[PDB]
Amino acid sequence: KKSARIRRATRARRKLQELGATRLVVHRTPRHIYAQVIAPNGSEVLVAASTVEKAIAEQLKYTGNKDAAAAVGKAVAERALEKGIKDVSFDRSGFQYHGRVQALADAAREAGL
């Protein structure tokens, strides 16, 4: 078969769909950072939390740094464990290393994922 438009952009991952589990997409914005736990077959979002929502707790500083990306990971993951999910793979479509995505992943494990 040919390479779908998505495969050409290599943003997706078929190797994580062969397992039949969930993902941990990490959206990044020059103002905010977002994370989700979408499941196969469309865009089924079970749990998610934005850095802007972190303010609801008691956030003061900017929401576009590293320490903020780690705070969101603990929130999205905490809510995930409350849902019923245990395992999850990391899905960072295009990005560098040691960036905010790594801090997001390291935060997810800190919760229990």
């Binding site: 078969k1 078929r14 062969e18 039949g20």
Partner: protein
Amino acid sequence: AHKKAGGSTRNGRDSEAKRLGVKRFGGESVLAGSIIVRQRGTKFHAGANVGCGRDHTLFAKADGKVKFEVKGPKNRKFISIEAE
């Protein structure tokens, strides 16, 4: 060096390909069929090729690619006996 004299292919021998893998009985995770080498994707029964369709069935065993862009090269999604 370069090629010349336009034409189709270039004549060979007798086709060496079969169709092993009943995929309705016991099936160890291995190449189900034989025609063209190199190809992956299908981990179970995924017989799906342009036309009236394709199919296979029953056999609990992780992974099980096909031959290549031939008898249903597409990769479906899981399948086993009925209660392994």
